[PDB]
Symmetry: C2
Subunit: 211 residues, 2 copies
Amino acid sequence: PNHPLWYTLCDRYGLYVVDEANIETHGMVPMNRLTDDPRWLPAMSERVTRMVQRDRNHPSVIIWSLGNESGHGANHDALYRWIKSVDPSRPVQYEGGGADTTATDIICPMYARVDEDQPFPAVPKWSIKKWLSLPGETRPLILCEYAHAMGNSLGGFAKYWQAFRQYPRLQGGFVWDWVDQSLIKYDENGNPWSAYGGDFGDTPNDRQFCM
Amino acid sequence: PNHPLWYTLCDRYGLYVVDEANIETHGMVPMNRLTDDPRWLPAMSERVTRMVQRDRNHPSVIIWSLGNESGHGANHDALYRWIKSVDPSRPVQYEGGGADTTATDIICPMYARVDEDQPFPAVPKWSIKKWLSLPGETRPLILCEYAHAMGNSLGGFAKYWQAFRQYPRLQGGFVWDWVDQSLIKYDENGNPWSAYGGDFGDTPNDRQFCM
Ligand code: NA
Ligand code: NA
Ligand code: NA
Ligand code: NA
């Protein structure tokens, strides 16, 4: 969840907001180790419930998210249902566990391609066009992250938009992402320069992957 | 309906048969002028009922068809339901009226393309990949006619097969069609040559379109 003023400004200027619980357990092995453990349900529930209690009156918020990259565990199912019960006015989405689990109203993959399947075991990233018509699938598809804009990038962006416009149930997505996460450092003169991962003696690091 | 020996041979050799009623009213304006007229129901019913009564024991017949290019009329709905009631063992398909009407268990367009929509009013031919995922649509898609093999043709045939293999619910199609409808004619010498439309004094005609 963002700074409270962010919602107010989105209300007044006009932007659709996905308000997202502060839950990411990307580093766990497997990714759902904590989110499937009932002993972590209380901690997780507070991050969902106190978000809804704070933000539910903002018109700009149109979708709740259960967090990010925490696999899919039973705690997600529990908290999905809690929101649907407490606030029927907004869809709930969550990408973990394959983007189309029982804890999401919206098929919301990250980095699924327009035409090409990426059939990883357990968590495949189908072509977005194919995903829509998998037997029994009815949900709309909106990418929670796509067109990774790292450095000299956004190649093939037009291909997404052509498909967004042709397929009613492909309703767009969220580019990853808005702003380079570079920090300002100084040399011996007093000249500012853009510092990324590794430039503060930090180790292990993932380097320029913040930008 | 075919010569009775056809079904026997398809039973023994192993081919899947779509058995189709002898109903085509293509030249009406509009196409359903007869099939929506309750006075033509008796005549239509006998073409459907008598086919089912003849052929229902043949294992090779796996799908019933209500005919071809006769628009979509209320008589089609009546007869669709008569088959479903009399023989639950086989799906019913019918292409008229836009290939996805209430009178078909299978989306069965003729000459719908792989990626390109052809948005004709009332009876659009959506791209087959798009058709699958239209809001609310659940049925499988099998083209009753595709890849027009007229003379030097079948360009793009591979594009169809790639999509059939990638999309579970795209379950193939029927090429149009098997055999050139040329006839053997003779001249002053006694030369056997191949004759198409018009070569018999017949007027009006549509020429090489029979091949
Ligand atoms: Na769309
Ligand atoms: Na990053
Ligand atoms: Na298929
Ligand atoms: Na023809």
